[PDB]
Each structure stands twice: as C-alpha cells, then as structure tokens.
C-alpha cells in the first residue's frame, strides 16, 4: 500500500550540446550513476518545446476520424496495407483495447531511398492524414522527429563519455539518412465504464495497461503527460516513476545492455492502468540497419566481452516481433 518512489534524478543535459568538455564529463558521470541505479533519469534543459508538442499531438488525436484510422492503419488492422508493419495507425477496439496510437519513422525514408527501393525490413515510407483535414500536422511531426533526434544525439554523447569512450561512439551510427528511430504518438483514453478486458493484472495485483518488458532500443527518449503511470522493477520491488511533463524520461534498451555486457542494464518497467486521458510520446533511438557496435565490458580491465556482435537491423526486426508476441499487438 506504500509503493516507494523510484530514484529518477533530473540531469541538466544542456552541456551535451556545447563544447565544454569538462562540463560534459560531469553530465556523463550523472548518466553513469543513473544507468547503474534504477536505470532511469529525467533529461532537463533539453531545449525542446514540449508544451507545443503536447498541443499539436492533442489536436491530431482529437480530430482524427474512424475513416482516417482505417485508411492509415497498419497491416495488423488492415490487410490491404501489407507494407505497413511499423508506420501508421494502431486502432483501439472499444470494449477490449483502450490504447491507440500513430507511429512514424525517418522522414528521409522516401520512395527513392535505397533501403526502400531494396525493400529492406523495418524501413517504410510514412503515411500521413490529408493535409486539409490536419493542417500543419505532418510538418510539425517531421520537425519534431528532427528536434528529438538532436536531443538524442546529445544524450548519446553523454552515454559514450559515461562508458569511457569518445563522444561519437554511438552517435556515429545514428545518422539522419538511415536511422531506424521511430516516434509513437500514443493516446490513453479516459473511459467510463473502463473495459476490464483492457486491464491486465500483474502478479503483485497491480492493474496494468502494458506488462513488464525491456525496451527494444539503444535508448528510449520519452515525453508523457503529468499523470503518474510508469513503474520500474528494482531489487526492492516495483517502484513508481514520478511524472514530469517538463522533462524527457530516459532509459536504456536491450541493445545497450548487449553492447555493455549488462553494465548498463535495460531496466524492466511496466505501465499502470490509470483511467485518465493522457499522452505517451516515445522516441525509440535505433541505429542504422547495418550498424554493429563491438560489445565491451567497462567492469573488466581489458574491456573484453563474452557476447557476439549483433547488427542493429537484426536486433530490431526480431525484437519488435518478440515484444508483440510477449505483450500483445498495441
Ligand atoms: C512506456 C511507453 C514508451 C509506451 N510503451 C511503448 O511504446 C512500448 C513499450 S516501450 N513500445 C512498443 O510497443 C514498441 C513500439 C515500436 C514501434 N511500433 C516501432 O515500429 O518502432 C506506453 O506508454 O505504453
Ligand atoms: Fe518501455
């Protein structure tokens, strides 16, 4: 009845945009400490206009129509859209499934992009609603991709320094022309009555909207409304992550755990059921399809690892399928 608050420090990441190397190292230390503890931190002083993000996302969610949702739907909901595994609309099912969302990928994945031409898995051309019906939405959303890409680049410099590397150790694989990163614009609704079929129950009795998992990402860069919902598993049990709709919640995904030999673990976390209208807006920091980082271990004098190199595209395609199998099609 007294779930403890998780330690989730607020780290001023602004030095990671600049050229003060000592200041950057002090930020890197804070990232290291958070990554070794609960595995979460809030990035503050990140430079992104999150109120405007929330506003523009709200305008999209509260004006998309049922017709548009079918017309944008991913393959899981619309068999006519065989090319849409990742990008498009993820429908709710009233009475059964409350959440709904819209996912988009790299705006540079155009019809003439070489990976689109090659039909390489996990690369897709984004689908968008009609401009007249959603004026400004596509432009805003594409610009948001680049704003959060920029923040993520800076965060990756911090993680690299934290791990004893040069600052471009990760960021050199995180490029505008080929990143597999995605934005998801998630709506969690208020519903009265709320369908019990859309509520899961954890082993400890907690009511959930999304079960325990580790992220399929290098890092995850998340903005949410100010409604508490996330919990992180620690040695002391599940602990509540306090909401902060001015900051970005950051954690590592399982690709970071792999390449650090679990020195930076991918924290296990879950989403509590809350009957409230809220937004959840993750950016999944994914590398390029052929990106391979040689695994290492910063706990060992020679840094040698017992893990094999894994290309990012292989990791991602299989990880996304496995997460659907484990925790359901969202
Ligand atoms: C905890 C939040 C990040 C959010 N959960 C999520 O977004 C969950 C768990 S990290 N993520 C996923 O299902 C993976 C979506 C990947 C996306 N379709 C893509 O093709 O790249 C939630 O609010 O439920
Ligand atoms: Fe997650």
């Amino acid at each position: 009845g007294s779930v403890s608050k998780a330690n989730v420090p607020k780290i001023d990441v602004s030095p990671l945009f600049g050229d003060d190397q000592a200041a950057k190292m002090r930020v890197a230390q804070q990232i290291d400490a958070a990554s070794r503890d609960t595995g979460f931190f809030y990035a503050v002083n990140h430079g992104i206009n999150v109120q405007r993000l929330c506003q523009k996302t709200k305008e999209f969610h509260m004006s998309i129509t049922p017709e548009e949702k079918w017309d944008l739907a991913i393959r899981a909901y619309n068999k006519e859209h065989q090319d849409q595994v990742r990008a498009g609309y993820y429908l709710s099912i009233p009475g059964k499934k409350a959440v709904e969302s819209f996912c988009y990928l790299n705006p540079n994945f155009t019809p003439d992009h070489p990976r689109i031409q090659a039909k390489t898995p996990t690369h897709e051309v984004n689908v968008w609603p009609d401009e007249t019906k959603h004026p400004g939405f596509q432009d805003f959303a594409e610009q948001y991709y680049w704003d959060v890409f920029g923040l993520s680049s800076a965060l990756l410099k911090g993680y690299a320094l934290a791990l004893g590397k040069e600052e471009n150790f990760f960021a050199r694989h995180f490029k505008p022309d080929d990143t597999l990163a995605s934005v998801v614009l998630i709506r969690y609704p208020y519903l009265d009555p709320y369908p019990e079929a859309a509520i899961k129950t954890a082993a400890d009795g907690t009511k959930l909207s999304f079960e325990w998992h580790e992220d399929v990402s290098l890092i995850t860069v998340l903005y949410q409304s100010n409604v508490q919902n996330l919990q992180v598993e620690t040695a002391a049990g599940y602990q509540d992550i306090e909401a902060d709709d001015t900051g970005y919640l950051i954690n590592c995904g399982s690709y970071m755990a792999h390449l650090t030999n679990n020195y930076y673990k991918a924290p296990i976390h879950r989403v509590k059921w809350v009957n409230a209208e809220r937004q959840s807006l993750p950016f999944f920091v994914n590398l390029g399809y052929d990106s391979v980082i040689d695994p290492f271990d910063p706990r060992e004098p020679n840094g040698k690892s017992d893990r094999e190199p894994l290309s990012y595209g292989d990791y991602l395609q299989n990880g996304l399928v496995s997460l659907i199998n484990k925790n359901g099609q969202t």
Side-chain angles (χ1 to χ4, degrees), residues 1-4 6-57 59-78 80-118 120-132 134-171 173-174 176-199 201-206 208-264 266-303 305-330:
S2 166
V3 177
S4 295
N7 288 339
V8 182
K10 294 178 200 301
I11 300 177
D12 177 348
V13 297
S14 65
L16 298 175
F17 293 103
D19 296 320
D20 184 341
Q21 310 307 332
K24 290 192 237 185
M25 287 297 278
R26 290 187 286 275
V27 177
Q29 184 280 320
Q30 296 172 263
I31 293 170
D32 180 72
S35 301
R36 297 161 63 184
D37 185 17
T38 71
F40 283 88
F41 66 97
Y42 274 106
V44 301
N45 304 114
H46 48 70
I48 300 183
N49 187 344
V50 294
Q51 188 277 344
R52 186 168 183 254
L53 172 64
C54 212
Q55 182 58 36
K56 297 291 181 182
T57 294
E59 289 169 14
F60 168 74
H61 286 313
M62 304 314 245
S63 71
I64 186 127
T65 66
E67 179 185 35
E68 293 178 320
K69 297 176 193 180
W70 289 124
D71 291 352
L72 299 172
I74 61 170
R75 173 179 184 169
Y77 298 96
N78 181 340
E80 300 179 14
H81 297 165
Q82 293 288 300
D83 290 339
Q84 296 185 235
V85 179
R86 298 178 70 194
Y89 204 92
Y90 292 52
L91 282 73
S92 72
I93 309 177
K96 301 289 180 187
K97 172 176 181 281
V99 70
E100 57 193 297
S101 62
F102 173 78
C103 176
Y104 60 102
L105 308 181
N106 193 331
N108 290 323
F109 294 167
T110 51
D112 69 5
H113 189 286
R115 290 291 195 172
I116 296 297
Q117 287 287 315
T120 305
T122 75
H123 305 75
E124 306 175 2
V125 181
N126 289 332
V127 299
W128 299 97
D130 292 353
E131 173 68 26
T132 64
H134 293 264
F137 171 67
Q138 176 175 356
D139 295 329
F140 177 79
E142 290 180 338
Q143 184 57 54
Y144 177 64
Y145 191 101
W146 299 119
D147 285 353
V148 72
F149 180 98
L151 169 61
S152 297
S153 290
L155 295 173
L156 288 181
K157 295 175 190 176
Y159 276 98
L161 291 172
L163 289 161
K165 305 301 177 186
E166 182 259 355
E167 73 177 17
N168 294 312
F169 182 82
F170 300 112
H173 300 281
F174 185 59
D177 283 348
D178 59 31
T179 176
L180 289 169
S182 62
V183 174
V184 191
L185 308 179
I186 310 166
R187 178 185 173 203
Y188 279 97
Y190 171 79
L191 299 165
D192 181 15
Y194 205 104
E196 292 287 337
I199 305 174
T201 298
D204 72 7
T206 305
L208 303 178
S209 289
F210 193 79
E211 261 285 14
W212 72 265
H213 63 289
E214 60 176 3
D215 284 359
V216 181
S217 66
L218 179 64
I219 66 170
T220 300
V221 177
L222 175 64
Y223 182 75
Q224 303 195 310
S225 309
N226 185 13
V227 181
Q228 200 282 321
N229 67 104
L230 295 172
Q231 301 184 307
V232 55
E233 193 175 47
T234 72
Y238 278 92
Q239 295 176 336
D240 280 332
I241 296 170
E242 298 313 299
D244 186 338
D245 70 358
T246 75
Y248 276 88
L249 185 68
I250 317 304
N251 62 275
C252 294
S254 61
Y255 197 80
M256 184 71 81
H258 182 71
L259 72 89
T260 70
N261 189 219
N262 230 24
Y263 177 72
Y264 290 177
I268 299 293
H269 55 285
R270 68 190 185 190
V271 179
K272 288 193 293 176
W273 169 69
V274 188
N275 192 2
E277 185 68 47
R278 65 198 183 73
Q279 299 175 336
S280 181
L281 314 179
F283 183 64
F284 298 109
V285 177
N286 295 324
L287 307 178
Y289 191 80
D290 287 333
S291 301
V292 181
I293 294 173
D294 287 328
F296 65 99
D297 191 341
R299 292 165 300 195
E300 298 302 335
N302 63 15
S305 180
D306 62 353
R307 286 177 178 252
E308 288 307 297
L310 178 62
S311 78
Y312 202 91
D314 183 1
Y315 163 82
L316 180 67
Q317 186 183 6
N318 292 296
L320 293 186
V321 170
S322 294
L323 184 59
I324 291 164
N325 293 342
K326 183 203 175 307
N327 281 10
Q329 175 64 60
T330 62

